[PDB]
Design a binder for this molecule. Sequence first.
Ligand code: LU8
Ligand code: LU8
Ligand code: LU8
Ligand code: LU8
Lengths: 292, 284
Amino acid sequence: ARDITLLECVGKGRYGEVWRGSWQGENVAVKIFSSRDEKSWFRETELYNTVMLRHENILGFIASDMTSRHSSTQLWLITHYHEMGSLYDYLQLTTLDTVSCLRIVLSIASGLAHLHIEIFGKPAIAHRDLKSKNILVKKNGQCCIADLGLAVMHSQSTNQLDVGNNPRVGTKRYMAPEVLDETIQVDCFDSYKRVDIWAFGLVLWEVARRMVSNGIVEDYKPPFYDVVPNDPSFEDMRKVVCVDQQRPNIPNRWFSDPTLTSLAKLMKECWYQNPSARLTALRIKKTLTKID
Amino acid sequence: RTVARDITLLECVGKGRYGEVWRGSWQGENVAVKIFSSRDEKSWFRETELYNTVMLRHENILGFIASDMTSRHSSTQLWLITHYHEMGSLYDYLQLTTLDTVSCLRIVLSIASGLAHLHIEIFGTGKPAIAHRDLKSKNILVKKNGQCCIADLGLAVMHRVGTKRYMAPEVLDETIQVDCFDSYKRVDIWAFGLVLWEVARRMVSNGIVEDYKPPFYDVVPNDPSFEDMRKVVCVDQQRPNIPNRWFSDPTLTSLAKLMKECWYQNPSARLTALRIKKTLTKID
Ligand SMILES: COc1cc(-c2cncc(-c3ccc(C4CCN(C)CC4)cc3)c2C)cc(OC)c1OC
Ligand SMILES: COc1cc(-c2cncc(-c3ccc(C4CCN(C)CC4)cc3)c2C)cc(OC)c1OC
Ligand SMILES: COc1cc(-c2cncc(-c3ccc(C4CCN(C)CC4)cc3)c2C)cc(OC)c1OC
Ligand SMILES: COc1cc(-c2cncc(-c3ccc(C4CCN(C)CC4)cc3)c2C)cc(OC)c1OC
């Protein structure tokens, strides 16, 4: 049984469209890529060829298709469906307790360490577009990382780095200093891992804002909401992150709560301008495993 | 809307190291389904990457329908779906069938037409230049209208090794200029000249025809080694035999000349696919 029914559109953007569909009686997600993003479709397909990519905290792959008649091409990705939506959606109108906040951020750290660490198989993988819209929320209170169209792969045993062919760049709001100032070392796998760590720290901040302590919580805001225009340009982000050396502010109410005090320390160790000073994904996972 | 993806696999029409090809049915319509071996996964990726870059559409190119990747419990399944040609490969067809002047010319001009379409860069939104890198009579299909189409872009390059029996001298002696796209066109032209020879042998003249044989059948073993081929093609500089009977027939006399000008040791002396088309249009 291969047939799918497209039932409702759950997202439309420059990327294309995502539909809730039905397959063998179950919900699936069907992404139809824009022509503009054909190189993301092919990269995501290369990544999902890897059987040992499968993980609790990585969006589950069902199929990939490229179809054509005459001069028209359609590009399809079929995945598991998460009806709670993205972490971005979820944080807009839910607050968290300690247990839920740590479960979410540990699950994302678990997914990211699974990507970064080679299995001897699954190459080491850097994502390059980590953000709260690219994380889905699951009914077990864990999350899974989505969108491997920009990913970079590295194999330690063979000294092979595969940066793919995709002129797409990461989401501007989440770009590390070395991406915004274009000094990143493009032939260095560790450089791409460190870009993911920066973005992870931003997602940690977005989540922690929504965790209640002492009867107080912050409203959902995206990273740098206070310092850049709506719909910030590459140069807008370069100004605040590289010129102004801005980092997200830590609300002072966090310092009364031991959990949020520990999280503030962790996100600050994701945000050093020196990429080599940043924590590893494995260290973040070990730190979050110890925090309560 | 309903997205009907079910394909009924009806009969296996090919099995090899590459995997399998099946005649299949989608929505009442025959399709061909290549199911890739794990050995040959990179051929699926390369053909899929090429079609994601340029949707080739030509009478003499096998028609693309789909690339499908399906997650299994323990493996990834890779299918390429194309038009189905019930007459099968030119290799298959030549075993039994003999040709007359009109059919022989229609076959070889259709292959040259496909090959020139691959080779040529077209500007606009056009196509990059493409070299095939594994041209042979098993990678050409026969159509009911008497024309052929070129198949298998798993080794194609845009601007696994080729089949050893069809390798040009510069591939066998490792002198090929690998940073020069024209080098890869010239390797295809060599292979084209061998396919021309295979087809010409099956053209009847004055009641005479040669039996089907693959190129170099009289000088190398079955599944020749790289070294077997190097010694024939590079060291001794042998070329396929032209029978005397061809020189009584004006079509086969012209085709002998053409195939000679695809087999020069010096790759830059070989005819271009566009020049081969022009020559073929002036025969008969
Ligand atoms: C993959 O292959 C086959 C596909 C199909 C097929 C099935 N549904 C819909 C379509 C379709 C409709 C509309 C557009 C365009 C039209 C103009 N503009 C507005 C953009 C949209 C594109 C595509 C097709 C082509 C049929 C086939 O054979 C009958 C195929 O061949 C096996
Ligand atoms: C990020 O990337 C991909 C994501 C998905 C995906 C998978 N499950 C569920 C969803 C989803 C469903 C519903 C809502 C919302 C809709 C409106 N409101 C806010 C309530 C609920 C949001 C999101 C998505 C978008 C699939 C993908 O590919 C098939 C993705 O690309 C890799
Ligand atoms: C995913 O996988 C396979 C799909 C198909 C297939 C089946 N029905 C319809 C389609 C279709 C084509 C094109 C559009 C257009 C129409 C609207 N326009 C504005 C944009 C989109 C819609 C639908 C397809 C592509 C066949 C397959 O096998 C032969 C598939 O598996 C390889
Ligand atoms: C070289 O490469 C590819 C070829 C094909 C392909 C396309 N049409 C028809 C065929 C075929 C059908 C039927 C017979 C036989 C059946 C028994 N008897 C009656 C003699 C003839 C042979 C061959 C094939 C093999 C598809 C491919 O991919 C999907 C190929 O790979 C790119």
